Enzyme design. Structure first.
Site, PDB file in Angstrom:
ATOM      1  N   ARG A  77       0.845  -1.173   0.000  1.00  0.00           N
ATOM      2  CA  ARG A  77       0.000   0.000   0.000  1.00  0.00           C
ATOM      3  C   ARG A  77       0.883   1.226   0.000  1.00  0.00           C
ATOM      4  O   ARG A  77       1.797   1.334   0.815  1.00  0.00           O
ATOM      5  CB  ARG A  77      -0.866   0.021   1.250  1.00  0.00           C
ATOM      6  CG  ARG A  77      -1.916   1.120   1.272  1.00  0.00           C
ATOM      7  CD  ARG A  77      -2.740   1.028   2.549  1.00  0.00           C
ATOM      8  NE  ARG A  77      -1.880   1.066   3.734  1.00  0.00           N
ATOM      9  CZ  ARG A  77      -2.163   0.512   4.915  1.00  0.00           C
ATOM     10  NH1 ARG A  77      -3.303  -0.141   5.122  1.00  0.00           N
ATOM     11  NH2 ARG A  77      -1.291   0.615   5.907  1.00  0.00           N
ATOM     12  N   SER A 140       2.987  -5.229   7.495  1.00  0.00           N
ATOM     13  CA  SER A 140       1.775  -5.916   7.942  1.00  0.00           C
ATOM     14  C   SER A 140       1.750  -7.330   7.360  1.00  0.00           C
ATOM     15  O   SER A 140       0.829  -7.699   6.627  1.00  0.00           O
ATOM     16  CB  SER A 140       0.522  -5.135   7.533  1.00  0.00           C
ATOM     17  OG  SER A 140       0.354  -5.142   6.128  1.00  0.00           O
ATOM     18  N   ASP A 169      10.938  -2.454  15.689  1.00  0.00           N
ATOM     19  CA  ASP A 169       9.587  -3.043  15.697  1.00  0.00           C
ATOM     20  C   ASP A 169       8.823  -2.828  17.014  1.00  0.00           C
ATOM     21  O   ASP A 169       7.604  -2.662  17.002  1.00  0.00           O
ATOM     22  CB  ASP A 169       9.585  -4.525  15.279  1.00  0.00           C
ATOM     23  CG  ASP A 169      10.525  -5.390  16.100  1.00  0.00           C
ATOM     24  OD1 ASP A 169      10.628  -6.605  15.789  1.00  0.00           O
ATOM     25  OD2 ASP A 169      11.170  -4.876  17.032  1.00  0.00           O
TER      26      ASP A 169
HETATM   27  O1  LIG Z   1      11.942  -8.670  16.723  1.00  0.00           O
HETATM   28  C1  LIG Z   1      12.019  -8.421  18.114  1.00  0.00           C
HETATM   29  C2  LIG Z   1      13.454  -8.105  18.517  1.00  0.00           C
HETATM   30  O2  LIG Z   1      14.344  -9.120  18.037  1.00  0.00           O
HETATM   31  C3  LIG Z   1      15.693  -8.944  18.483  1.00  0.00           C
HETATM   32  O3  LIG Z   1      15.753  -8.894  19.903  1.00  0.00           O
HETATM   33  C4  LIG Z   1      16.244  -7.636  17.933  1.00  0.00           C
HETATM   34  O4  LIG Z   1      17.549  -7.416  18.444  1.00  0.00           O
HETATM   35  C5  LIG Z   1      15.352  -6.466  18.334  1.00  0.00           C
HETATM   36  O5  LIG Z   1      15.806  -5.291  17.680  1.00  0.00           O
HETATM   37  C6  LIG Z   1      13.890  -6.736  17.996  1.00  0.00           C
HETATM   38  O6  LIG Z   1      13.079  -5.732  18.591  1.00  0.00           O
END
Ligand SMILES: OC[C@H]1O[C@H](O)[C@H](O)[C@@H](O)[C@@H]1O
Ligand SMILES: O=C(Nc1nccs1)[C@H](CC1CCCCC1)n1cnc2ccc(F)cc2c1=O
Length: 427
Positions: A77, A140, A169
């Site tokens: 998107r 997504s 994230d």
């Molecule tokens: O994907 C969830 C997490 O995975 C790992 O811990 C990464 O180092 C981190 O950056 C991320 O937030």
């Protein structure tokens, strides 16, 4: 439920963590978080507590108009966003694009040439080629994209566009959940990895000068355990997983929680039960004896079994096993033991953060935004996790939420923040 086999329960009870155990872990995590936040100790701290530069006050005010590009599985998107005025209005127009077979099966460059062509068409449609807009990515899903798009835009050489760095994230989770609930000041992921971010008092963020307001801190707490903080809780299975991992001795906390390792932990537990002649009549399959063969998805599927044992039988049959009904029940409890311990360990971390936030701000109502495959797909994981967190956080009222796709405005807000941050940082 039936009276369980005593010898199986003795082995599975190894995974138990009492409240006192979790409080000990929580306190240790809190000391490591302290270490990460302080200037004097940050360099050597395993839990980095990275300042995200996402502040409690609006910044990058000169960023009004931007693109948000949401990457799905087989489509994306493109969204034009205007953030305006005391709470932000998120005004949008957008277009879904299907990725043709041609563009999806070739090189990443060719894929991003196609994405760039779609952006170009989109900007033509909305008569926006007069502006150099910043663009943020959101995901997504059911080389990195920033670089691929940046290169592809350079390749085109017909319109100018900035692609901004993505936020972590956890931060994206916090922001998107904040869109729906303005009391959200914590983001957490329990997926393949595990991590959390939260809105820390600026006085405690010693890496950024200022004591006014708050800033999101990305704990990167997966690195916890580096100096033996978890050693007393590690089981033989954990030690084996760590020894055979890509980074032995590192990410020990994450190795107890993440979906990257959960299935492998179960596999090793099942092999222990086989070796003790408590499972599969002491006869493991060659698949069961193969590293990685018990996938984390299998753990969630096993715990999804409705009681007829058909989900469990199908998983185990695929592994070259012919389980009895008792075998199936034991496997379920082995899965439950591992996932429950993951929920417990994770709860100690979040509890440490929440209790820190409560005391930093001096009863606290707070919303925690959560995403990740384990938290979302795993039967009763979130429920066990919630219960444990709440048990460890007296005088806090915690609401847990998951981002709702909605009309994509939560995702738009993530891109707004990413673009505003990039502007603020002179990027
Ligand atoms: O994907 C969830 C997490 O995975 C790992 O811990 C990464 O180092 C981190 O950056 C991320 O937030
Ligand atoms: O955009 C923000 N900070 C930035 N720092 C650097 C660049 S932009 C923060 C972020 C939020 C994130 C969730 C916790 C509270 C702060 N933010 C986000 N979205 C908002 C929506 C409405 C509103 F009235 C205020 C904010 C706001 O301050």
């Amino acid at each position: 439920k039936p009276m369980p086999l005593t010898l199986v329960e003795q082995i599975l009870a190894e995974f138990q963590l009492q409240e006192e155990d979790l409080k000990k872990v929580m306190r240790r995590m809190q000391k490591e978080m302290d270490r990460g936040l302080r200037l004097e100790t940050h360099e050597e701290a395993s839990v980095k507590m990275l300042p995200t530069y996402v502040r409690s006050t609006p910044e990058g005010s000169e960023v009004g108009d931007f693109l948000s590009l949401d990457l799905g599985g087989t489509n994306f998107r493109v969204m034009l966003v205007k953030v305006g005025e005391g709470q932000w209005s998120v005004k949008t127009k957008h277009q879904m694009y299907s990725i043709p077979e041609d563009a999806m099966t070739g090189t990443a460059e060719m894929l991003f040439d196609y994405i760039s062509e779609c952006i170009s068409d989109f900007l033509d449609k909305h008569q926006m080629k007069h502006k150099k807009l910043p663009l943020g990515f959101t995901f997504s899903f059911p080389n990195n994209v920033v670089g691929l798009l940046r290169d592809a835009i350079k390749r085109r050489g017909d319109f100018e566009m900035d692609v901004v760095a993505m936020v972590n994230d956890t931060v994206a989770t916090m922001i998107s959940c904040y869109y729906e609930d303005h009391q959200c000041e914590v983001g957490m992921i329990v997926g393949t990895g595990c991590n959390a971010c939260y809105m820390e008092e600026m006085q405690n963020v010693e890496l950024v000068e200022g004591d006014e307001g708050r800033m999101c801190v990305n704990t990167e707490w997966g690195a916890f355990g580096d100096s033996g903080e978890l050693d007393e809780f590690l089981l033989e299975y954990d030690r084996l997983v760590d020894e055979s991992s890509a980074n032995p001795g590192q990410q020990l906390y994450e190795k107890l929680i993440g979906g990257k390792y959960m299935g492998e932990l179960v596999r090793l537990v099942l092999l222990r039960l086989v070796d003790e002649n408590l499972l599969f009549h002491g006869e493991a399959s060659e698949q069961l004896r193969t590293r990685g063969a018990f996938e984390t998805r299998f753990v969630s599927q096993v715990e999804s079994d409705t009681g007829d044992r058909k989900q469990i039988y199908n998983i185990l049959s695929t592994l070259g096993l012919r389980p009895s009904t008792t075998d199936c029940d034991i496997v379920r409890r082995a899965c439950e033991s591992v996932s429950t311990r993951a929920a417990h360990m994770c709860s100690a971390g979040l509890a440490g953060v929440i209790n820190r936030m409560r005391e930093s701000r001096s009863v606290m109502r707070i919303t925690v935004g959560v995403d990740g495959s384990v938290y979302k797909l795993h039967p009763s994981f979130k429920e066990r996790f919630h219960a444990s967190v709440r048990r460890l956080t007296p005088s806090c009222e915690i609401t847990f939420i998951e981002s709702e796709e909605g009309s994509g405005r939560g995702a738009a807000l993530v891109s707004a923040v990413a673009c505003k941050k990039a502007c603020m940082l002179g990027q």
